[PDB]
């Protein structure tokens, strides 16, 4: 009753602080970009008298609508390819059960919305057992690798607490290279994103936030290799279980900090 | 090891089946839609001879360069509202720590992307601490309300397992009216969405999927009331805990089905 109110106050303060920081970091640039395209549009109207202000704003608005829906407004004909072909439909099904939900592909039909509701109600807990199994498989593999070292070093194990500590340290160090650093390097070369855009995609994907602004394997102008789609699929599958384990440890550290605050305030 | 492979096979089959169903339900409708920006752009060039193809291409490319990083909900891109005013920046901060991430508002700047990475790393576990407390608060409140029912159930010599099952189903039934049915009725009248679109929004939001195709409080053409934004904020906050408890019960039902 009192602990839940204390954490609610901390979360509200964290949200207000975050809102103030994100506004200071984004609003002046957004205001600069809004006036920048506004002046270019106003000059376009005086250079091209045959076009009226509404006529131009209709095409510009529709160009933005097509771009945000996956169809590039640059070039002669884009053909729009297919968002619901068996391959992309399988990947869409994954964005639902994993709770990432990029939103680049989403059901328009009534049948798709009805099926999506039931698909997430039974699929999300089903994926959670696979994620618990993968986390256990990773912990058992890392536990075996630490037990082999403790056998060759001739150290007597009083309890599996020493193995648990060493395996958590090696897990977050090695796992950061395998699921965070190396993938971002691949995304920089394949997608052509910046070093920051690539690392921003990894965190947003593995934390299940999935804004949809950056999606690996979604550029029509890029001919992706045969191994690329299944590699990203396997990276999300295991990388979600890695990030969930790291975020669980961070949650424990915050719970430990709460007991220190309780003791100091008492 | 063998258990993990068995669940992986089930998940892959569930994904392939889902892919086949979503393709059959969406691909024929997608193939029917012939409206494209390429034909509208080609017609624009013949209607306005004073503009050349490269002159139009230049303005269209610059419009995309000046566009926000977020993809606005379906049918709400011509709003031109400030995506980063204190109010909508507070709501954006919520989409990160709750893991919903609609993506209607998203950081374009380098400073925003760096801060968003650290904001998610420390904010998501912080919100989890709160969600655990809210789930406990819901369980205690429900437990107090059902204590009269459990007293009558215990009087008639009913086993403690039978009482546990009936109580959990009553949590889903009352909780569905409070966090699923009543909110969807409000979204139908306020947003003007269909009965299905409103229920589709609720499930996608409370399961933290958050596609971004439907966002409550994102229509420029609708003048929202003063109480609307904080009501949706409070519904998301406590509704996530109810849905996490329900999804946990669904997982238990699947484990029971496995023993059968």
């Amino acid at each position, epitope marked *: 009753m009192k602990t839940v109110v204390a954490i609610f106050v901390v979360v509200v303060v964290y949200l207000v602080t975050g809102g103030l920081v994100f506004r200071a970091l984004e609003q002046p640039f957004e205001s600069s970009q809004k006036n920048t395209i506004a002046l270019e549009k106003a000059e376009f109207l005086r250079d091209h008298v045959c076009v*009226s202000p*509404q*006529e131009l704003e209709t095409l510009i608005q529709h160009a933005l609508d097509a771009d945000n829906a996956g169809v590039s407004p640059i070039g002669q004909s884009s053909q729009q390819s297919s968002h619901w072909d068996l391959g992309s439909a399988f990947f869409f099904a994954g964005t639902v059960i994993t709770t990432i939900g990029y939103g680049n592909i989403a059901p328009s039909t009534e049948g798709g919305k009805i099926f999506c509701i039931l698909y997430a109600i039974f699929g999300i807990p089903l994926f959670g057992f696979l994620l618990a199994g993968i986390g256990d498989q990773l912990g058992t593999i890392f536990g075996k690798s630490i037990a082999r070292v403790e056998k060759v070093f001739r150290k007597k194990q009083v309890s599996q607490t020493k193995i648990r500590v060493i395996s958590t340290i090696l897990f977050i160090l090695a796992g950061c290279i395998v699921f965070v650093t190396i993938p971002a390097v691949i995304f920089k070369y394949i997608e052509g994103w910046t070093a920051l855009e690539s690392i921003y995609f990894v965190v947003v994907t593995l934390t299940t936030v999935g804004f949809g602004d950056f999606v690996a394997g979604g550029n029509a102008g890029i001919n992706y290799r045969e191994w690329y789609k299944p590699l990203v699929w396997f990276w999300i599958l295991v990388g979600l279980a890695y990030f969930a384990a790291v975020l669980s440890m961070i949650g424990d550290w915050l719970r430990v900090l709460s007991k220190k605050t309780k003791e100091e305030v008492g | 090891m063998k258990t993990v492979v068995a669940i992986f096979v089930v998940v892959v089959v569930y994904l392939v089946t889902g892919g086949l169903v979503f393709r059959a339900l969406e691909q024929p409708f997608e193939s029917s839609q*012939k*409206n*494209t*920006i390429a034909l509208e752009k080609a*017609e624009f060039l*013949r*209607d306005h001879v004073c503009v050349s193809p490269q002159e139009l291409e230049t303005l269209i490319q610059h419009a995309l360069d000046a566009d926000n990083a977020g993809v606005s909900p379906i049918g709400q891109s011509s709003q031109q509202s400030s995506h980063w005013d204190l109010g909508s920046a507070f709501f954006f901060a919520g989409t990160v720590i709750t893991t919903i991430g609609y993506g209607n508002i998203a950081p374009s700047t380098e400073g925003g992307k760096i801060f968003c990475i650290l904001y998610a790393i420390f904010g998501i576990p912080l919100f989890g601490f709160l969600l655990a407390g809210i789930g406990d608060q819901l369980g205690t409140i429900f437990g107090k309300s059902i204590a009269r029912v459990e007293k009558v159930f215990r009087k008639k010599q009913v086993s403690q397992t039978k009482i546990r099952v009936i109580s959990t189903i009553l949590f889903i039934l009352a909780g569905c009216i409070v966090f699923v049915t009543i909110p969807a009725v409000i979204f139908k009248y306020i947003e003007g969405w269909t009965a299905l679109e409103s229920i589709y929004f609720v499930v996608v939001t409370l399961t933290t999927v958050g596609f971004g195709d439907f966002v409550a409080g994102g229509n420029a053409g609708i003048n929202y009331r003063e109480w609307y934004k904080p009501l949706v904020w409070f519904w998301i906050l406590v509704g996530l805990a109810y849905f996490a408890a329900v999804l946990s019960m669904i997982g238990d039902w699947l484990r029971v089905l496995s023993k059968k």
Partner: nanobody, 126 residues
Framework: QVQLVESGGGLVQAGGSLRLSCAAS????????MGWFREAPGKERDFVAT????????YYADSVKGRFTISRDNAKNTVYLQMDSLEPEDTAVYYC????????????????????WGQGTQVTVS
């Protein structure tokens, strides 16, 4: 709500001509894709002709190509349909329609592709 009002129409002999017009309300006519449809008694609304937002790109159904001419005047918020070499098969209630959606006029050949509709004008060829 945008209002579309049709005028012109009537009863003519086979081979004669007619000129339909459709006035629209508001100040966004130049942004709509305009089109003409026809409802024969007991038959569904068939596509007749469509026109780009500016009026330079015309599209026609195979049954009226070479005989009908769709044109527009954004200055007067009006869309026109000149019907030459009329046949008894062209006897139907002609509807004017406006489209305020993404895409070009070339693909707006279905009645469901439009957002606003007129009251209809009767055209009879004997």
């Amino acid at each position: 709500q945008v209002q579309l009002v049709e005028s012109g129409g009537g009863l003519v002999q086979a081979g004669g001509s007619l000129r339909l017009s459709c006035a629209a309300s508001g100040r966004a006519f130049s942004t709509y894709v305009m089109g003409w449809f026809r409802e024969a008694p007991g038959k569904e609304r068939d596509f007749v002709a469509t026109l780009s937002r500016g009026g330079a790109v015309t599209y026609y159904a195979d049954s009226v190509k070479g005989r009908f001419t769709i044109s527009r005047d954004n200055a007067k918020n009006t869309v026109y349909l000149q019907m030459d070499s009329l046949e008894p098969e062209d006897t139907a209630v002609y509807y004017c329609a406006a489209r305020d959606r993404l895409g070009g006029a070339g693909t707006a050949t279905f009645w469901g592709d439009y957002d606003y509709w007129g009251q209809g004008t009767q055209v009879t060829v004997s």
